[PDB]
Design a protein around this ligand. Structure first.
Ligand SMILES: [Ca+2]
Length: 223
């Protein structure tokens, strides 16, 4: 997250870190046994880390649980990033409390102008590299589809939205991918892609979760 603020420990209780020896992507806890992330974060050997603030220090609220199954969306396209969404089943259920909690799926899609909260452990610089140990947060609005398509001609599908600031300076970044965009208490986006981070006229692009609720619910019910 570029241009954000330190969230505070366990203030984003649905945020997870995906770990394969190191943090590589975020995700969101949607019930006690399932996480949703970005398909481009797929790899084998995932440990899901719940209850994290500092990802390099054991602080006392963590739960570390291996994945048993990963399910990339049937229609994910790695070249265009269309359908950039993946479900991860935990080997055992997490213990839920005020510091480790699920986020609700949306019943309706959010409109442009709605303010959302984006969070992650990704790079904090638009030039160069500095990775934080503690969770960072950013408040940002959903942009109109017309603004989004004008920023990224030929690249925005109906399964994507832009959020952020056309003036730049505040955005998600590398290492935030897979993490949550929460608006009005519901999961509306997944950090997906952008051109650099925090550049003028290049806001972040997010997977539009409201298009996937049926697939998510059916998949959980059967797996
Ligand atoms: Ca920790």
């Amino acid at each position: 997250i570029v241009g954000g603020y330190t969230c505070g420990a366990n203030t984003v209780p649905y945020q997870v870190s995906l770990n394969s020896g190191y943090h590589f992507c975020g995700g969101s806890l949607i019930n006690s046994q399932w996480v949703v992330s970005a398909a481009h974060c797929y790899k084998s050997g995932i440990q899901v880390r719940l209850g994290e603030d500092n990802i390099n220090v054991v602080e006392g609220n963590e739960q570390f649980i291996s994945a048993s199954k990963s399910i990339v969306h049937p229609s994910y396209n790695s070249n265009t990033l269309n359908n950039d969404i993946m479900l991860i089943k935990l080997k055992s259920a997490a213990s839920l409390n005020s510091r480790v909690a699920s986020i609700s799926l949306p019943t309706s899609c959010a409109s442009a102008g709605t303010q959302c909260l984006i969070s992650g452990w990704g790079n904090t610089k638009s030039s160069g590299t500095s990775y934080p140990d503690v969770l960072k947060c950013l408040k940002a609005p959903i942009l109109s589809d017309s603004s989004c398509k004008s920023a990224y001609p030929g690249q925005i599908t109906s399964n994507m939205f832009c959020a952020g600031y056309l003036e730049g300076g505040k955005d998600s970044c590398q290492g935030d991918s897979g993490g949550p965009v929460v608006c009005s208490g519901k999961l509306q986006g997944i950090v997906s892609w952008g051109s650099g981070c925090a550049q003028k006229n290049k806001p972040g692009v997010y997977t539009k979760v409201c298009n996937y609720v049926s697939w998510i619910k059916q998949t959980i019910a059967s797996n």
